[PDB]
Design a protein around this ligand. Sequence first.
Ligand SMILES: CNc1cc(N2CCC[C@@](O)(CNC(=O)c3ccc(CN4CCC(C)(C)CC4)cc3O)C2)ncn1
Lengths: 201, 236
Amino acid sequence: LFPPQWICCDIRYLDVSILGKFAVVMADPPWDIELPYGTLTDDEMRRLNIPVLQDDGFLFLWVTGRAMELGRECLNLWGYERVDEIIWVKTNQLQRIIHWLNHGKEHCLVGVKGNPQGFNQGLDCDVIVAEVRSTSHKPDEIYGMIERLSPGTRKIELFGRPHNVQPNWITLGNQLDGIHLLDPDVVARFKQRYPDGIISK
Amino acid sequence: NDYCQHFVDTGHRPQNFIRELIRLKDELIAKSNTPPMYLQADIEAFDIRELTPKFDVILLEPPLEEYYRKCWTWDDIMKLEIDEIAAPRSFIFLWCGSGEGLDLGRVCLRKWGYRRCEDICWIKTNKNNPTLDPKAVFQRTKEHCLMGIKGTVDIDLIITEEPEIGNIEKPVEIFHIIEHFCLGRRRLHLFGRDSTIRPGWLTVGPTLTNSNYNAETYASYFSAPNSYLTGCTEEI
Ligand SMILES: CNc1cc(N2CCC[C@@](O)(CNC(=O)c3ccc(CN4CCC(C)(C)CC4)cc3O)C2)ncn1
């Protein structure tokens, strides 16, 4: 079901096997790197049941600081090979660039699992130039790049927020407003697994 | 405006549309710089331990096959004994390319005892001319230079036009970033060329046409009272 869907949940505890398989996974995790949001420990990050989410497709994993290394560890642990690395160059509205060096970019690792067939590889390049609209937000250009890469397929975003919900995407995060599911396969398995609608333990 | 969509429509890369003095520091650097020193050496057969003294900064630029539409694999690079010539407190800048080097270069840094503190991206514009590795998902339009540290003004971006094919030179701007860190005066550039020789640097590589390296002469530049200068201070 093409229109946006989401589940407010603790991603540590959700049984993601009910969601099916996805052509693209994207995660912008709250890595534990003095932050204005709750985080996941390195072990919680490692233990995420990413492997059940895809058979053949791509993973987009935002990383910063020491998560440039921890993110690579997780990516490999979850069964992906890192095959690309997108950078978003942060600009203002006049298209100017916003420890040892000031930081002008954010990094997104691109992992592959299996042997994806029928994707449009090489349409976009690995550099995003876009304005920092709101702090802590990722640039909306990434969704368009992913859609041209894999048009019409099911996608899932972990640790997203309400402004991230998108057609063809299911968005998970603990600040979303309730549960909004339209795919009948997913609705059926959700009711089975969560008959009283609560996601605990 | 969506420059990713625009690149798909036109072939103009999104980076094509990116638009105090700090010059007396550059003059201090210039005054403190040792004479350029350089040595032709086939690094696969050469015992790097003959390169003394131990270096404050190492710039490592192995010729990767991806640079070409003698090449060094990451197998070769990983087996260099860089830790044997790095000072206990010292820095490394490793050009890693755009493919498997972003991973294997991190293995190298840890193998040699460094931790990465920066990831410096050379973003290449194509303003003047609006490949595909089989594993690539996207067109690769940048190269990474990883900064490693061991022991206890600028931006992490360099933007220039993509060089003509077969030109493997890296932007000279990388030297400016390194020298502005004021990390010390023993600076080694492995796999440099005649074209990269520079005051303040010892350049070692297989394609150099001439050498002037003398270990005792070189060490004499850093004998007391000049052993701990940052390279951004006045002469003593
Ligand atoms: C405990 N179990 C949980 C926890 C959980 N979250 C914890 C609270 C927040 C939230 O609700 C929503 N996520 C963020 O606000 C959020 C903010 C900033 C960032 C950092 N990025 C770095 C790269 C970038 C700059 C491009 C973009 C920013 C990542 C985020 O993820 C997710 N969600 C489900 N289960």
